[PDB]
Amino acid sequence: HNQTDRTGATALHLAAAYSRSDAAKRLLEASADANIQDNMGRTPLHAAVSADAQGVFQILIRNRATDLDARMHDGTTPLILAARLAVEGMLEDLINSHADVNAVDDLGKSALHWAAAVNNVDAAVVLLKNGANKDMQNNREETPLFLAAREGSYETAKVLLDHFANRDITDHMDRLPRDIAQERMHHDIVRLLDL
Amino acid sequence: QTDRTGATALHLAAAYSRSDAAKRLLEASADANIQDNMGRTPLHAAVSADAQGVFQILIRNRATDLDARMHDGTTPLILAARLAVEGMLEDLINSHADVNAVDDLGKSALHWAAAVNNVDAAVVLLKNGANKDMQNNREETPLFLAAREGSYETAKVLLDHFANRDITDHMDRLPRDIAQERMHHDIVRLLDL
């Protein structure tokens, strides 16, 4: 019931991963724990996001006891995961359900850092519109703009610059976003930063 | 809905303990917090009907406002306190309802429990951080209200919680004075202990 398999997956994890809406509801009605962590610290909500299981995702976010800010064993939250995976809708649904927009994983990266690293531009816009700290530094003193520049995420770097993200905040080695873009040969980003 | 009393389908599911209906409406994105003519949401109606199945469905639904106010400021917790329904007041508290919210007369759920001598609710409320000394608009503490209404069991609870017996109403009456006035002999002697 709250019994797990070899991967630490409960029945509720499996419903998430397999898109079993009804099984998910019966489990939750029977007081099944919504926040049990599997071997990687994923709760069923992490699993619903990874599986892009829209039905179970909606059931889990509607359930008041679900921890929308639950952390995997590397501090990854459902919001960071949705940002990284670029699944449709879930990112904005979590935000509208009051997930913490500025929570960070264990390396100090927020959902916006990750939207920038993977060039998930729609996620960055939604995050920025809902109070994401555009100039947040992670443990390595990297801002989302720094990561965009490093990864060649032109479209997301442009959204951040249009939101007046601070282009002079350097990383732990004193590198500007312009510097890391130049080192990594992202000439288009260098040009964008020079405008 | 809404209908003639201002009841949506979800109010009616609450009033008649229809759990299947309530679940179906919520999963179809019905607004959990529509007020009827008296300012009741489906959650107030479930408390009033003592509808345990629908009550549980509603409180497990994230978007339900557990602290919703009727037109006199009555919250679900206050209503559960007044009515002395089983289970519901504790479940609201455990779901993080505001223990210290007040109706428009400034009465908290603890004020009400004292007034109706709902001693179990007083114990639960005090255990979860209720202000034992909170004064309402008329400057009445829950101890004062227990004293006035002859609520021995609840006045004992609040005294055991070191409620301040010296706090007076707007006419500067002690709980001891009002018990004396209303000839609640058990309370006066309770208070002289």
Curated annotation (Swiss-Prot), chain A:
Shown portion of the complete protein runs from 1921 to 2114 of 2555
Q: What is this protein called?
A: Notch 1 intracellular domain
Region: HIF1AN-binding, residue numbers: 27-35, 94-102
Q: Which organism was this protein described from? A: Homo sapiens (Human)
Compartments where located: Nucleus
Q: Where are the ANK repeats?
A: 7-36, 40-70, 74-103, 107-136, 140-169, 175-194
Where in this protein does the record say (3S)-3-hydroxyasparagine is found?
Answer: 35, 102
